[PDB]
């Protein structure tokens, strides 16, 4: 069992890992504001009493 | 194994090594009956 000598053996195998990344909280804040602006502009916002 | 070495070796079940591994049909972490 070695690379090129057996099916299922890999030289550079895929490994389990964490796919999460990091982003600036300021960027997240600005993105939330932009999303609200976009919903207002595209008319996808409705306000309800309760 | 020949008679002289057999006369000095001991049987496998004379110790506790048999119960210190989890090898089983399902793998290496056997959960015994009754947990």
């Amino acid at each position: 069992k070695a690379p090129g000598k057996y099916v299922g053996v890999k030289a550079h195998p895929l490994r389990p890992h964490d796919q999460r990344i990091k982003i600036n909280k300021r960027l997240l804040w600005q993105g939330l504001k932009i999303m609200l602006s976009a919903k207002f502009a595209q008319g996808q916002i409705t306000v309800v009493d309760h | 194994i020949r008679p002289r070495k057999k006369g000095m070796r001991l049987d496998r079940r004379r110790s506790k090594k048999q119960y210190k591994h989890g090898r089983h049909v399902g793998g290496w972490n056997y959960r015994w009956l009754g947990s």
Binding site: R15, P16, H17, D18 | G27, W28, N29
Partner: peptide
Amino acid sequence: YKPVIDWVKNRINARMRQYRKRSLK
């Protein structure tokens, strides 16, 4: 006979390597 894989050990080792690798200084 079949070559059954020890997933417990393999995945534990992979996690250990991942954590060390991503915490190196």
